[PDB]
């Protein structure tokens, strides 16, 4: 299928680009992100233009396109 490049921005201004398949559950993205960042899956929430991303949302379902940005926030105060 087709893929798009998404930019995931954290509160430390770190920006991580991922090539993602349009029809895949973003659970994989969130999981990949949390592990590479070294934090629990439940310690972060991922937002796409105001909408929180569910594990079973896909880029196509959310209307995401090339270069779109996903913002990540902590569920709890600084470590």
């Amino acid at each position: 299928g087709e893929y798009i490049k998404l930019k995931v921005i954290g509160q430390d201004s770190s920006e991580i680009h991922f090539k993602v398949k349009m029809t895949t559950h973003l659970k994989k993205l969130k999981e990949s992100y949390c592990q590479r960042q070294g934090v629990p899956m439940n310690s972060l929430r991922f937002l796409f233009e105001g909408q929180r991303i569910a594990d079973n949302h896909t880029p196509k379902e959310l209307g995401m396109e090339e270069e779109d940005v996903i913002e990540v926030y902590q569920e709890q105060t600084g470590g």
Partner: protein, 216 residues
Amino acid sequence: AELLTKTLPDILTFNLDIVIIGINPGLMAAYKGHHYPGPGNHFWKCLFMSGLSEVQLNHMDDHTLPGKYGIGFTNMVERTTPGSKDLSSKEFREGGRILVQKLQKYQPRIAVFNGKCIYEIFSKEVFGVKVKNLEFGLQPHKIPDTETLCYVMPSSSARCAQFPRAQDKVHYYIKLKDLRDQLKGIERNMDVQEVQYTFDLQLAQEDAKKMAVKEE
């Protein structure tokens, strides 16, 4: 024995996919007799964060890497000593000969250089070439007379100025894993693929400092 006389037994075998190569044994590594003992090093954290290891391991697990992960360890120079980035040309050159000899014997799929510094030294003393515009990742040259690839990653030592935290370096461990899988024909889940990592240096340094202050 006094610390500067100690050496660090390498961990090598045949059929390895990866051999982590540093300049020489770090002080804590030589002291404890294990590779990359933290907290002044990000190797073990990056190893888990990139998915190269199934669980979070530490230096005391180094012996299990060949068998369970196809990963081994050695260094350019066996002599322990700080300021190893500026050892003599002759010591580096001789260490390089010995290193290439071991690589030609064990034939690991990928020689992974822990930092641009060591690869620059290796290229100069082994290839006889001062590399220009050295990039991280895969290099075009193989270990002399072998099919062993050369892969360069950011130094795992916490002293690395360009990348303050483990998360600022893990990107290349992830890319190394992707390459490794490719070589072994391991099915790669192309649904998600990390292609780039950029960050704010100053906020990273400050973050690294804070976490370092938090006593567990």
